[PDB]
Each structure stands twice: as C-alpha cells, then as structure tokens.
Amino acid sequence: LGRLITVNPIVTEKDSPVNIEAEPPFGDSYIIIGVEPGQLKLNWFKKGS
Amino acid sequence: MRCIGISNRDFVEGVSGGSWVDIVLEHGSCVTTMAKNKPTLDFELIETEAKQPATLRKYCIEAKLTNTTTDSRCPTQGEPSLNEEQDKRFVCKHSMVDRGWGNGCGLFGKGGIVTCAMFTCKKNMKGKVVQPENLEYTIVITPHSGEEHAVGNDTGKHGKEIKITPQSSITEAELTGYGTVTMECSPRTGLDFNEMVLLQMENKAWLVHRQWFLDLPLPWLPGADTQGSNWIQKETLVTFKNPHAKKQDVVVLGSQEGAMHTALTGATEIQMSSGNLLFTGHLKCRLRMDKLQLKGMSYSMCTGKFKVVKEIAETQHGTIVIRVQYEGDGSPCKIPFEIMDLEKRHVLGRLITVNPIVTEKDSPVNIEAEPPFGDSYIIIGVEPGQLKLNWFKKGSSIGQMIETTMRGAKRMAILGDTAWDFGSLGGVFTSIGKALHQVFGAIYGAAFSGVSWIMKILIGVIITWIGMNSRSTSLSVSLVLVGVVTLYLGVMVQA
Amino acid sequence: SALTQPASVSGSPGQSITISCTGTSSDVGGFNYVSWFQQHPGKAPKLMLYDVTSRPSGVSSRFSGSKSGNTASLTISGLQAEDEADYYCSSHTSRGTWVFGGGTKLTVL
Amino acid sequence: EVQLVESGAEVKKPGASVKVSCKASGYTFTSYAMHWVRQAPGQRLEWMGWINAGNGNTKYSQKFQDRVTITRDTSASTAYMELSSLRSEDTAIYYCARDKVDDYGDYWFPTLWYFDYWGQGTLVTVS
Amino acid sequence: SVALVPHVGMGLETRTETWMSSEGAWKHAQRIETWILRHPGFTIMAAILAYTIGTTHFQRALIFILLTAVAP
Ligand SMILES: *[C@@H]1O[C@H](CO)[C@@H](O[C@@H]2O[C@H](CO)[C@@H](O)[C@H](O)[C@H]2NC(C)=O)[C@H](O)[C@H]1NC(C)=O
Numbered sequence: 008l009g010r011l012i013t014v015n016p017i018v019t020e021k022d023s024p025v026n027i028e029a030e031p032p033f034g035d036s037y038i039i040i041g042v043e044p045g046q047l048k049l050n051w052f053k054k055g056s
Numbered sequence: 057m058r059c060i061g062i063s064n065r066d067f068v069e070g071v072s073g074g075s076w077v078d079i080v081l082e083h084g085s086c087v088t089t090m091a092k093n094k095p096t097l098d099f100e101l102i103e104t105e106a107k108q109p110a111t112l113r114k115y116c117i118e119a120k121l122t123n124t125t126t127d128s129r130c131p132t133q134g135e136p137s138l139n140e141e142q143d144k145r146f147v148c149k150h151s152m153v154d155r156g157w158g159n160g161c162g163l164f165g166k167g168g169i170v171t172c173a174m175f176t177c178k179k180n181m182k183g184k185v186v187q188p189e190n191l192e193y194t195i196v197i198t199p200h201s202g203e204e205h206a207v208g209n210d211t212g213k214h215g216k217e218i219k220i221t222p223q224s225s226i227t228e229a230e231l232t233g234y235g236t237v238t239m240e241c242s243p244r245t246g247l248d249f250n251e252m253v254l255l256q257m258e259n260k261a262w263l264v265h266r267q268w269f270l271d272l273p274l275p276w277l278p279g280a281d282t283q284g285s286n287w288i289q290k291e292t293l294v295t296f297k298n299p300h301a302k303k304q305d306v307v308v309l310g311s312q313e314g315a316m317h318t319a320l321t322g323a324t325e326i327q328m329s330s331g332n333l334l335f336t337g338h339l340k341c342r343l344r345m346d347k348l349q350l351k352g353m354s355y356s357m358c359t360g361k362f363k364v365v366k367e368i369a370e371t372q373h374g375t376i377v378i379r380v381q382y383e384g385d386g387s388p389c390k391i392p393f394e395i396m397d398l399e400k401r402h403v404l405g406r407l408i409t410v411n412p413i414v415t416e417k418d419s420p421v422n423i424e425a426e427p428p429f430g431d432s433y434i435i436i437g438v439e440p441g442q443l444k445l446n447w448f449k450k451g452s453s454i455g456q457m458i459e460t461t462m463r464g465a466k467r468m469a470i471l472g473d474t475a476w477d478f479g480s481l482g483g484v485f486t487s488i489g490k491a492l493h494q495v496f497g498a499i500y501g502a503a504f505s506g507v508s509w510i511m512k513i514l515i516g517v518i519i520t521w522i523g524m525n526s527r528s529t530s531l532s533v534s535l536v537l538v539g540v541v542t543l544y545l546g547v548m549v550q551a
Numbered sequence: 552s553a554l555t556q557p558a559s560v561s562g563s564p565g566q567s568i569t570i571s572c573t574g575t576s577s578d579v580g581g582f583n584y585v586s587w588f589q590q591h592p593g594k595a596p597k598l599m600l601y602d603v604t605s606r607p608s609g610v611s612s613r614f615s616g617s618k619s620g621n622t623a624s625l626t627i628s629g630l631q632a633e634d635e636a637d638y639y640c641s642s643h644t645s646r647g648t649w650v651f652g653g654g655t656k657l658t659v660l
Numbered sequence: 661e662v663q664l665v666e667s668g669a670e671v672k673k674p675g676a677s678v679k680v681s682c683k684a685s686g687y688t689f690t691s692y693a694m695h696w697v698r699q700a701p702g703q704r705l706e707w708m709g710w711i712n713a714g715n716g717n718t719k720y721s722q723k724f725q726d727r728v729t730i731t732r733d734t735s736a737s738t739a740y741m742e743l744s745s746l747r748s749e750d751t752a753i754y755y756c757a758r759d760k761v762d763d764y765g766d767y768w769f770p771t772l773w774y775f776d777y778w779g780q781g782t783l784v785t786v787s
Numbered sequence: 788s789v790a791l792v793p794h795v796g797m798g799l800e801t802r803t804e805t806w807m808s809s810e811g812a813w814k815h816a817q818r819i820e821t822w823i824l825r826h827p828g829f830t831i832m833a834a835i836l837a838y839t840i841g842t843t844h845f846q847r848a849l850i851f852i853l854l855t856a857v858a859p
Contacts (some may be wrong), residue, residue, distance in 0.1 A: 066611065108619060108620035110576060110580060110620070111576075279576070280576045280577055280580075280645065282575065282577075282583070
C-alpha cells in the first residue's frame with residue numbers, strides 16, 4: 008500500500024546517492040528498500056489524509 | 057528481574073497468529089511477556105533522549121528599566137518627540153497630563169507626555185523544539201531465571217541495552233544463553249512531537265504544548281536572535297503609573313518566576329541539563345519471539361535437598377518470590393518446581409520464571425510464580441530432601457476480573473487509542489474497537505479540551521441529567537458513552 | 552563571526568580521522584549549507600563536499616561528512632599521501648552572507 | 661572545458677585604488693553569479709563578493725560595504741572588482757568564484773554547490 | 788497574568804505525575820469557597836437572581852452554581 012512516484016529508481020555509478028519519492032497512505036506505512044540482508048525498513052506516519 | 061516491586065506490571069500473554077505480540081510500554085511500567093515456550097522477558101522503557109534541539113522563542117522572566125526619561129508638550133500642539141523613542145529597546149507610552157501657567161506653557165489644557173526606559177533582561181527561558189527524527193529511546197530487556205541478588209534493581213547490568221530510533225531497523229537483541237528478540241518499535245506515533253516545546257527555565261525543564269507556549273504573555277525574542285536587545289511585547293513586564301493627571305513614571309513589574317511555576321500545573325517535568333532527557337510518554341512495540349531458547353534442555357533434573365534463604369513474599373497481586381539455594385552435586389541442573397493442592401494430585405497455578413535452572417551451586421536462584429486463590433503447596437526438589445512450603449494467596453474471586461477491568465479502563469484513560477494494544481490482532485474486535493475508538497476519540501478531543509478537573513464533572517452531570525429526562529430511548533445514548541465516561545475521565549485526569 | 556575549525560590535525564596513512572567545525576544557529580544550526588575546500592598551496596582551492604554530505608564528480612568517495620546541529624564534520628577514510636592541504640569549511644547564513652572557517656592543515660606523517 | 665582566467669596587479673602603495681578582472685569562459689555569463697573571496701598568505705578565506713546576474717545586483721560584505729564597488733559588461737563576458745582605499749594589511753590573493761542564479765533571473769537563494777569552478781588568484785602587495 | 792491559563796486541558800498527560808498535581812487540583816474550589824465565606828452577600832444575590840429567572844427546578848441550581856463560580 009503506497010504509490011511510488013519516482014518510477015523504477017535505478018543506481019548508476021554506485022558511489023553517488025539516489026533520491027526516491029513516494030506517497031504513503033493516510034495511516035502509518037513502512038518503507039522497504041533492501042531485500043534479504045540489511046533490508047532497510049523505515050517507519051513513517053502521515054496525518055489525516 | 058527488574059520487574060518485581062514495580063506497582064504497574066501488565067502481564068501480557070499470547071504469541072498467537074504468527075510469532076509476534078503487540079505491547080506498549082511506558083516509563084513507569086515494566087511489562088512481562090509469557091508464552092507456552094519462549095522464556096519470560098521483562099521490558100522497561102528507561103529513558104527518552106532528544107538529541108539536537110533548536111530553540112524557537114526566548115521569553116524573559118525578570119527585567120529592569122534604566123535610562124528612564126520623559127518628555128511633555130503644550131496642549132493641542134501635538135505629541136511629544138523623544139530622541140530614544142527610535143530604539144525598540146526603550147518601551148514607550150503616550151498619555152495626557154494637565155498643563156497650564158504653573159507648568160510654564162499656557163492655554164490651560166491637557167497636554168501630551170511620553171515616557172521611555174531601556175528594557176534590559178536578567179532571567180530568560182528557552183523554548184527548545186525537536187523534530188520526530190534524531191531522538192532515541194533506551195529500553196532494557198532482562199530475562200528471567202534470576203541469579204543471586206537480581207530482583208528489582210536497576211543498578212548493574214542484567215539485560216540487553218538496545219537503543220531504538222525512527223532511523224532504526226529490526227533491532228535484534230542478542231540475549232546471552234537465550235535466543236534473539238527483535239522489536240519493530242514505532243517511535244514516531246508515540247508521543248507526537250512537533251506539538252511539544254521543551255521549555256527550559258533556570259535549572260528545571262518541562263514539556264509544554266506548542267500553541268500554549270506561543271500564546272504566553274511575556275516579552276519574547278526569537279530563538280535565533282543573537283544580541284538579544286529587541287524584546288517584542290515589553291508592555292507585559294512594565295507598567296505606567298499615571299495616578300493623578302500629573303507626572304507619570306515607569307516601574308518594572310517584577311520577576312515572573314513564581315507566576316510561571318503556577319503557569320505549569322500540568323506540564324510533565326523533564327530533565328534538560330547535560331542531555332535533553334525525558335521520562336514521560338511511551339511507545340508501542342511489535343514484539344517478535346520467533347528465535348528464543350529456554351536455556352534448560354540438556355540439563356538433567358536435580359537430585360534434591362534445596363534450602364531457602366529468602367521466604368515466600370507476595371509482591372503485589374499474587375506473584376510470590378522464593379530464593380532457594382542449592383546443596384548437592386550435578387550443579388548444572390533444572391530444579392523440580394511444582395505447585396499442587398493439598399494432596400499432590402492436581403497442579404494449580406502457573407510458573408512464571410519458566411524452566412528455572414541452577415548454575416554455580418553456591419549461588420541462589422530466584423523463583424517467581426503465580427498461585428491460585430486459596431491453599432497452595434509450593435514444592436521444590438525430590439523426595440529425600442523435599443520442601444513442601446505452604447502459601448495462602450488471600451482468596452479473592454472475580455474481584456481480580458473487576459480490578460482487571462478497572463486497570464483496563466485506566467489504561468484507556470492514560471493511553472487514548474494506543475490502549476488497544478497488549479493484544480495480538482484479534483482483527484474483527486481489536487481493529488474495529490481501535491477504529492471506532494479513534495472516531496469517538498476525535499469527537500471527544502477538540503470538542504472537550506481546555507476544561508479541567510472540575511468542569512468535566514460539571515458537564516458530565518449536565519449530560520447525564522439531560523439523558524435521564526429525554527424520550528425516544530435516547531436515555532442510553534446520552535449516559536453510557538458521554539455521561540459516565542466523562543465522569544470517569546473527569547476523575548482520572550490530572551495524573 | 553567566522554567558524555571554529557581547529558588549527559591542524561595529523562594522521563598516519565591508512566587511518567580514518569575527522570575534522571570538526573562549530574558555529575551558530577544561523578550558520579550551521581538550521582541550514583543544510585556546509586561545504587569544504589581543499590587548497591594545495593600552489594593551487595586554487597578545490598571543493599570536496601557539497602551541501603552536507605554530497606560530493607562532486609571526480610572527488611573520490613574517501614571524503615564524507617555530517618552535521619550534528621551547530622557542528623559539521625569531515626571524515627577522511629583511508630588517508631593517502633595526497634591529502635596534504637588545508638581544508639576550509641563554508642556556510643551560508645540566514646542573513647545572506649558567506650563565512651569560512653579558520654583552516655585545518657593536515658599532515659600525513 | 662570551463663576556464664576562468666584573471667589578470668595580476670604588481671604593486672599598489674596604500675591609498676591607490678586597485679581593480680582586478682576575471683574572464684569567465686565556457687558558459688553563459690549572464691545566468692551565473694560572480695563571487696569574490698580573498699586569502700592572505702597563511703590566514704583564512706573571508707568573503708568579499710557580491711551577487712551578480714544579468715540584472716547586476718550587489719550584496720557586499722558587512723566588514724567593508726563602504727569600501728568596494730562594481731562594474732561589469734556582458735559584451736566582454738568579464739566581471740570587475742573595484743577595491744579603492746588600499747591599506748597596509750590588505751596584501752592578499754584574490755580568488756574568483758561563480759555559482760548559478762535562479763531560473764527567474766534573480767539571485768535569491770544560492771545553489772547547493774557554491775564554487776565548483778574557480779579562478780587563478782591575483783596577488784597584490786604594499787610598499 | 789501568566790498565573791492564569793495554567794496548562795491543564797491540553798491532553799499530553801501520561802502516568803507519571805505532573806508538576807503540581809495533588810496541590811493544584813483542589814485550589815479552585817478552596818479559593819471560591821473561601822471567597823463565598825468571606826463575601827456572602829453576592830451568594831445571597833445570586834440566590835435571588837438565580838431563583839427568579841430560569842423556570843425549571845434544575846436551571847436554578849445550574850445558574851446559581853455558574854453565577855457563584857464566575858465571580859471568583
Ligand atoms: C542489583 O544488582 C547489583 C549488581 O550485581 C547488585 O550489586 C552487587 O551486590 C553484591 C552484594 O553482595 C556485591 O557483592 C556486588 O559487588 C554488587 N555488584 C555491583 C555493585 O556491581 C545489587 O545488590 C542488586 N540489588 C538488589 C536489590 O538485589
């Protein structure tokens with residue numbers, strides 16, 4: 008649940024950061040980035056909406 | 057195991073569904089989790105640390121007025137003009153004196169006068185604010201099977217010391233001997249910062265509402281205002297004495313500190329001195345117990361002759377604690393702890409430190425357990441050296457169901473809608489109860505906020521009295537959810 | 552009203568040392584504008600880090616940094632021999648101006 | 661491929677006005693600002709510059725706002741410093757510095773990168 | 788002054804106690820009732836004025852409590 012805006016964000020030239028943008032829903036959602044080791048999971052809460 | 061002796065206990069049980077359970081833990085509450093396997097742990101939130109705050113508005117408390125001067129001008133030919141009215145240091149006030157030939161002007165009318173005095177400062181307060189990132193919660197996880205002298209102490213480490221941020225992760229806590237407990241804590245929805253101002257007077261500190269802090273009449277200054285000369289509403293700390301229609305003068309209004317400690321009746325005190333520590337609030341958890349060992353398999357059962365060195369002591373709602381000390385050989389061993397009725401036929405009452413073991417024979421072990429209502433016979437060891445101790449838990453009834461009901465409504469009074477945790481997703485009851493409680497919560501709040509201890513009881517008696525006189529069976533509409541609930545909330549506030 | 556990075560710093564080759572600089576709530580304390588400039592003595596100064604932690608093309612990923620309120624840092628992981636130049640910090644005030652730090656000349660032996 | 665060359669003044673006694681020049685080459689000169697910093701040998705970098713555009717606005721330093729002035733000409737694609745009332749302690753190397761103005765022509769907020777491309781450095785002395 | 792609006796009806800409360808609860812919880816009833824016993828004539832006046840207007844028998848008590856509570 009949650010729409011991605013920066014569609015298929017890719018890494019080019021690994022030693023250079025990448026900024027991603029998405030729309031979380033009206034409750035709290037969770038931001039999964041990695042996969043099996045170090046799955047970079049984040050919390051975000053959104054008001055009202 | 058840090059949890060015995062604390063009057064707020066909240067035993068939670070059930071790892072159903074997957075392998076997780078929801079718990080929400082406060083600062084003055086240590087929570088114990090039980091399961092059919094998966095040994096009993098104790099969770100206590102010990103501190104909250106906001107790392108890097110930035111002040112937004114600096115009020116001042118006590119000031120003084122120097123360089124006081126005044127200037128007057130004849131009737132009907134305009135206001136006076138003083139040279140240091142141009143600085144916004146000097147607080148100004150125009151008024152009308154009586155002037156005439158004795159004053160040396162003429163025309164016999166009411167003149168104009170102005171008065172200025174330079175407004176310095178002596179005592180400030182700083183309103184520091186944080187954003188809900190860059191702040192951590194320190195939480196301690198002490199397992200059971202107590203070694204020698206570790207029951208309710210906080211001094212000395214006995215459990216893991218994991219820190220949890222909103223920047224954080226799964227947060228594996230690797231308990232030695234036991235498994236590895238992971239906590240999916242959600243600190244952003246915990247205490248709701250960005251509406252909180254970390255107020256900081258001379259040597260104390262509080263946690264005040266933001267809109268309350270901005271609506272506060274004292275001469276203030278922006279938090280980024282270096283060289284703090286331009287105090288803005290200086291007229292709330294000066295007064296202008298024009299008793300008769302003659303010479304007026306400025307006097308400072310005095311230190312507003314004692315009227316500020318009365319302003320803060322409701323601000324939970326925090327500690328802002330060598331760290332911006334908080335000791336209030338909470339956070340909910342997702343407590344995953346998929347990887348926990350009991351530490352006690354492949355330890356053979358004991359060979360009797362135990363010895364008690366601290367007797368049965370019922371600590372706070374029937375959770376007795378014994379400290380036996382073992383005499384014998386084969387020193388890595390489980391102990392035979394059972395709780396029977398009179399003749400040893402039925403087992404009554406669970407054990408709470410599940411699977412207690414002995415390590416290093418000349419060191420006692422603490423055993424906590426839960427007896428039933430009535431006679432119980434605590435049993436340690438085997439038959440050559442049997443210890444059959446008596447205990448009578450003071451026989452209550454469903455009175456513990458009515459005090460569990462009062463504890464549950466109390467927790468719904470402190471925690472608004474987070475109080476539908478301690479449950480592992482009942483689904484059609486837990487989520488629908490939490491959802492309708494958030495609907496009825498936001499119609500309670502922002503339609504009943506600002507009033508206090510007395511006015512909630514007054515409005516509750518008004519709503520209860522209107523409900524007891526209406527028709528079309530709106531009696532039970534205006535009693536069971538808005539009348540008696542606002543009397544109960546009317547008496548449980550001001551915690 | 553200049554920033555407060557120290558006099559000098561030393562490091563053996565292969566170490567990972569840090570260079571700190573403090574300031575005020577208008578310099579560093581609110582804004583994400585802090586940059587670093589390596590300046591070899593017979594050379595124009597070359598920038599090493601963008602806004603807080605970013606980095607120009609051509610600059611190696613050895614250079615990194617962070618901010619802790621009023622204080623910004625620069626950590627050089629894996630010191631080589633060619634880091635023998637002073638590092639000047641930079642900022643942008645709320646007032647509109649530009650300030651630079653004192654300068655930390657870094658020796659490699 | 662972006663080159664910003666300068667010109668050097670030899671020796672200026674205290675009292676005389678001195679001006680330096682930078683020839684910004686490799687980009688559109690009217691859509692990039694032009695800052696000026698200085699460095700005495702063995703001391704800091706302090707910021708002398710102002711905020712050019714196609715407009716030609718200024719923002720001088722608080723230390724010597726009443727000391728420096730400007731001129732520029734985009735037909736020559738060069739920006740000119742003007743430092744009058746030279747003094748005894750004013751022996752310093754004057755560096756050139758660019759950053760990009762807004763797409764609306766004005767220079768309200770700077771870019772996140774300030775000085776990606778630089779100048780040479782102009783040495784003045786006293787006698 | 789700032790001794791008014793004493794930061795009470797905000798929410799924001801947890802199980803640990805506030806700055807001064809158990810003192811500033813019974814200050815207003817003690818204050819208005821030492822005011823009543825040291826200024827009784829306004830309570831007689833609010834009894835006649837409250838009994839006059841407000842027809843039904845609960846409006847007398849509500850208007851009387853509110854009129855003796857607004858005046859400190
Ligand atoms: C809480 O734990 C600490 C840490 O073990 C206990 O302090 C120990 O007390 C014994 C008493 O014989 C000393 O020999 C140790 O040196 C102490 N250890 C320390 C200070 O690290 C403390 O007694 C425990 N508290 C309670 C109430 O049992």
